[PDB]
From a paper:
To rationalize their different catalytic regioselectivities, structural analyses involving X-ray crystallography and computational methods were conducted. We solved the crystal structure of an SbSOMT-resveratrol-nicotinamide adenine dinucleotide (β-NAD) ternary complex (diffracted to 1.72 Å resolution, Fig. 4d; β-NAD was utilized as an additive to improve crystallization), an SbSOMT-resveratrol binary complex, and two ternary complexes reproduced with pinostilbene or pterostilbene (diffracted at 2.10 and 2.56 Å, respectively). Other hydroxyl groups were shielded by water molecules and did not directly interact with SbSOMT. Overall, these structures depicted a productive substrate orientation within the substrate binding pocket which greatly favors A-ring O-methylation. So far, our results revealed that SbSOMT catalyzes the 3,5-bis-O-methylation of resveratrol upon fungal infection.
Whilst SbSOMT shows global structural resemblance to SbCOMT, molecular characterizations illustrate two hydrophobic residues (Ile144/Phe337) crucial for substrate binding orientation leading to 3,5-bis-O-methylations in the A-ring.
Residue numbers in the entry:
A (entry chain D): 13 to 377
B (entry chain B): 15 to 377
The structure:
Amino acid sequence: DSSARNEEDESCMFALKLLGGFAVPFTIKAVIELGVMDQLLTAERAMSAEELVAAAVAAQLPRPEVACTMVDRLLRFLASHSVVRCTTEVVVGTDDATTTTCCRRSYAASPVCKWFARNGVEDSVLPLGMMILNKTFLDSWQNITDAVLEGAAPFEKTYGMPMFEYLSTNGPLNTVFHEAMANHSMIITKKLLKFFRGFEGLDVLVDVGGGNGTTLQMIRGQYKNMRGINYDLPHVIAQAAPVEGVEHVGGSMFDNIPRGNAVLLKWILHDWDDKACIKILKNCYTALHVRGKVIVLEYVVPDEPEPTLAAQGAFELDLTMLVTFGSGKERTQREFSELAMEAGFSREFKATYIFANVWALEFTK
Amino acid sequence: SARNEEDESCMFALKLLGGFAVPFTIKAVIELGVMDQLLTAERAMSAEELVAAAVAAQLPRPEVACTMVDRLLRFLASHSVVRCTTEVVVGTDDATTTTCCRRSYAASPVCKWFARNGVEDSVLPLGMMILNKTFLDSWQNITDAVLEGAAPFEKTYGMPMFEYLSTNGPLNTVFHEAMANHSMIITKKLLKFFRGFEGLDVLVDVGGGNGTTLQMIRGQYKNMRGINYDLPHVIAQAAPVEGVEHVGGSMFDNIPRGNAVLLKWILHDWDDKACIKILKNCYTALHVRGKVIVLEYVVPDEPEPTLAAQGAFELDLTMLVTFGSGKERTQREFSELAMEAGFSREFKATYIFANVWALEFTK
Ligand SMILES: Oc1ccc(/C=C/c2cc(O)cc(O)c2)cc1
Ligand SMILES: Oc1ccc(/C=C/c2cc(O)cc(O)c2)cc1
C-alpha cells in the first residue's frame, strides 16, 4: 500500500511522540537521584548497569538483579535519545543483571550530561532542574484547563494562593526555589563578567531581588571601585550579612527604588503583567539619574513561533510563567521597548546576548 | 566555538529536563475544546475566535482566558503542532498577548490523531490514559521503586495496577477505553495488511474484552468462529456477539482450544516466566499446525536514535513504571519465549502500524 501507508504510520507515531514527551525528563530525574548520572560523569570507561548501581548506591539492595535490569532499561531509553552512549559486548557465561542474555550494554555520558552534575554549580543547571521537575510545579501544569477558564494562574488554582505566598508557608519548596534562582544567577552572572561591558565606569549599582549570594559580590569582585545596593523586601534584608562595599536596603519595588547610576532586574519583570511592570520601571526611572540605565536580564521571545531550539525554550519559559504566575509572561524586544517608553525611557536601547537564552537589555534616561 | 557549543549544550540540557511541557499543553488545548475547533475550522483562527467557539461556560475574565490560549498555541506552533500566521491589528486587540500582532492558528496534519467524538483515526482515548495524573504520578517515584526493585505504580499505590483498577471505576474506564481504542485501530490495519487469519476455523482472543475485536475480524472472515477468553468478572458483563462463544477463566490455568490464539498487548505486561506459563497453555490449547499471533511492539537489538526505536523504548519504560517486570521485547527474546514454551524454530513477523507487529509462532 506503498507510501500513503507510511505517511499515516509516521503521523500516528508523531502524535504518540508528542503525547509522551515527559518520559525523557522523568527518566533523567530518576537516573540523577540514583547517583547513576554522577557516576557516568566521573567515569573513564563505559560502564554497565550492574557496575553503575554498585558504584552509585552504597546500601545493600533487597533485589539487586532487578534494580540493575531496571537501570539498564532506563539508560537504554536515554541512549535512544542520544543522552548516553551505549556499547554492547558478548556474554562469556550468562550475566543476569542486564535485560538481555546474549549482550551486556555499557553506558557513557554524552557531553550534555555535565549540566546534570550534583557536586556543585561548576557548570550545572541541576538545582534549577530540581525545581523545574518538583511535584508541586508539575501538579500545576496538569491543571491548566480549569485555570484558563477562571482566567487564573494554574499554580494558584491548584494550591489556592500565589506561589510566592506558598513558598513562605513551605520551607522545603522555598529552599528549592532559592537554590534554583541562585543556580541560574551564578551561571548567568559568571558569563556576564566574560561577555558584557555594561558594568564599567558605574559608581553605584542597585540589585533588585538579590542579597545572600548577592551577585553584586561577584560583580564588585571584578569592578573593585563599584559600590552596590541590594534592594529586596525587609523579611529578606533582615537576613543579610554586612558585605564589603554593599549597602543592603529593605522595601517594596512597587513603592520605591533606590538611587544609582544603574539598576539590575534579573528575572523580575517576567513574573508580572505589563501594568505591574510599568509601576516597577517607573520607580526605576525616578531612582535613576539622567545618563543612567536599567539592565534587564531576561529571555526575549522572537516575533513569531519559529521552530528552533532557542525559540522553543523561550516559549517554554513563557508557559512556565503562565503556570506559575498567569499574567507573568515572556516578551519580545519590541514589547520590552514599549514598556520602557511607557515608563519614561528614551528611544535608545541596547541588547547583548549572554548565555542560555538570556539577554542583557539596557534602557537609558 | 566553545562559547557557542557550551551555549547550545546548556540549552539542550534544559530542553531535556522540560519536555513534559508539550504533552501537558496539548492536554489542556484538548480539554478546552480548542483542538476540536482547529480540526473543524475552514481558515486559520485566533484564540478569541476559538475560545468563543469551544467554551459554552460563562467566562469571568474572558480577555485573560484568550491571551492564555494564545500563549499555549504560540508554544505548540513553535513545535510544529499548529500552524501560526500573524497579522497587524488596526485598533486595540487585548485578546491575543501581543499589542501589534494578532496570531491565527490552524491544525497540522498530526492533530487529526487528537480528534474527539472518537472516529476512525484518533488515539485520543489512549492519549487520555497516557496523560492521566494517576498514571503520571508513578513516574515521580521511579527512584525509590528501582531501589526496592519494585514497580513504581505499586510503590505509589501499594498494589498492582490491575487490582488498583477494581478500586477506581473512573480510571478503569479510562484504561478500558484506551485499550479498546488502540485495539480498534490496530485491528482495522491488521485486516488490511495481515493475511494470517486466512483459513482459520476457530480463533481465541485472550483478554479481548467484550469480543469487539473478534466481531471485527469475523466481519471479514465470515466462516471463522471466535472464542473470547477473559476473566469471569469481564465475561459476565460482555454482550452476545454472532459467532463468538465467551469463555471465563485465567490464562495462567489454561486456554480454550483453537487454530490460533491472539495475544494483543498481553505478553508485555509480564516477566519471562509468566509469559512462558501463558504460551505453554497456548501450546496445549492449539491443535497441530496452530499458531500464536502476538501483537506487540518489538524493540530493536540496540538503542538506535530513531523515531521508531524511541517510541518502543518509551513503551518499555511505561511497562517498567506500570508493572516493573512487564517489559518490551526484541524479536530474539520473543523467539526464546516461544522455544521455552515448546514452539518450533520458525517465526513470522508482519509490520502493522504504529510500531506494532504481528508475530506468529507455529506449534
Ligand atoms: O505511545 C504510547 C504510550 C503509551 C502506551 C501505553 C500502553 C499500555 C498498554 C498496556 O497493556 C497497559 C498499560 O498500562 C499501558 C502506548 C503507546
Ligand atoms: O528550561 C527552563 C529554564 C528556566 C526556567 C525558569 C523558571 C523560573 C520559574 C519561576 O517560578 C520563576 C522564575 O523567575 C524563573 C524553567 C525552565
